[PDB]
Amino acid sequence: YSWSEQTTLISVDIEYLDKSYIYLYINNVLISNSDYSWNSDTLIQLNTTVLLVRRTDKEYLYIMFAEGAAFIRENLDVQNTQFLHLAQELVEGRSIDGFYGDLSMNGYRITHLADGVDPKDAVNKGQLDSVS
C-alpha cells in the first residue's frame, strides 16, 4: 500500500503527500531525483526491475498552522494523512532498518532468511543441515 515493485516511462499508483517523498530503485540501486522528471502525478520519465518506495519525513509537520491564516476542511485531512501514511510504511516493513534492543518473539519462527556470509549474520537451517 506504500511501495510498488514492477523502459522510459514509469507509473506511480501509490498516493503521496509530496513528489520528493518517492524514491525510485532500479535493481536495488537508488537514483537521485535529478536523473528523472515527473511528467504528471502518475508518470515518471527517466533521462535515459523498478521499485518505488515512499518515505514521508517525520521531522516537520507537513501542514503548519498559523494565526490569522486561511483555513479549509482539507487541511485537517492532509495533516491526518501524513500520520496515516507514516504508519503505512511502518507496517510495510520497508521503513525500519534495524533494532536497538533484544527481540522477544515468543515461540515464533522467522522465515525466508538469506544465507549470511559475514559470520556475524544470522543463518538458516538450509546451511545447518548441510553442515550436519
Partner: protein
C-alpha cells in the same frame, strides 16, 4: 509580550490594536509570520546568548552525533565545516554523517519571543512592523521613520551585547603582561 509586538505592528498600519491572543479577524497573522522570520534571521548570527558543545564523543556503533533541535547556525571550534542534516551533525567538506573523534563546535540556538532581551525584542518587533508596512501601505516617510526606530533599537542591542561580552584587548597583550611578570 508577543501580543504587544503584534499590537506594535498593528499600530504601524494604523489599525486598532487587539487584546485577545490570536483570535482576531484582521490580517494580523502576517505580523506574526514576519516577526518569526525576522527573529530567526536576526538571531542567525552569533549573539551573547548562544550555547557551546564543548565535547561530544560519538558512540562507534551508530556513529552519528545529535545536535540541539532549536539550533540556527553552527561553527566548528577547530578547522571543520559543520551543518545539520536530519537533525544530526554533518560534515560539509566530507559529505558524511559519521564521526569517530570528539567535536568542539559553537552552535547558535533560537529563542522564543517571550524569552529574549528587551532591546532585541523591540528591534525584532519594529523590523517586523517596518516590513509589514512596506508590504501593505507602501514606502513613505512612515517606513523611513520605522526603519530609523529599528536602527536605534539595533544600536541599543549592540550596546548591550558589547556590555555583556567584554571585548577589551586581552589577546596579544597577554604575552606582554606575562613577560612583565
Amino acid at each position: 509580550r508577543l501580543t504587544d509586538a503584534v499590537n506594535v505592528t498593528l499600530e504601524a498600519l494604523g489599525e486598532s490594536r487587539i487584546v485577545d491572543i490570536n483570535t482576531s479577524n484582521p490580517s494580523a497573522g502576517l505580523a506574526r509570520a514576519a516577526l518569526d522570520r525576522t527573529r530567526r534571521g536576526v538571531l542567525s548570527t552569533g549573539w551573547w546568548f548562544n550555547t557551546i558543545i564543548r565535547e561530544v564523543t560519538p558512540t562507534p556503533n551508530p556513529g552519528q552525533i545529535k545536535v540541539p533541535w532549536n539550533q540556527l547556525s553552527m561553527y566548528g571550534l577547530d578547522g571543520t565545516k559543520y551543518g545539520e542534516r536530519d537533525g544530526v551533525l554533518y560534515n560539509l567538506v566530507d559529505q558524511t554523517k559519521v564521526f569517530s573523534d570528539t567535536v568542539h563546535l559553537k552552535v547558535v540556538i533560537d529563542i522564543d519571543f517571550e524569552d529574549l532581551p528587551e532591546h532585541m525584542a523591540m528591534w525584532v518587533a519594529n523590523a517586523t512592523a517596518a516590513q509589514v508596512y512596506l508590504n501593505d501601505l507602501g514606502a513613505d516617510g512612515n517606513y523611513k521613520s520605522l526603519l530609523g526606530i529599528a536602527a536605534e533599537y539595533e544600536a541599543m542591542n549592540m550596546r548591550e551585547h558589547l556590555r555583556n561580552q567584554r571585548y577589551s584587548t586581552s589577546r596579544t597583550h597577554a604575552a606582554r603582561k606575562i613577560r612583565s611578570g
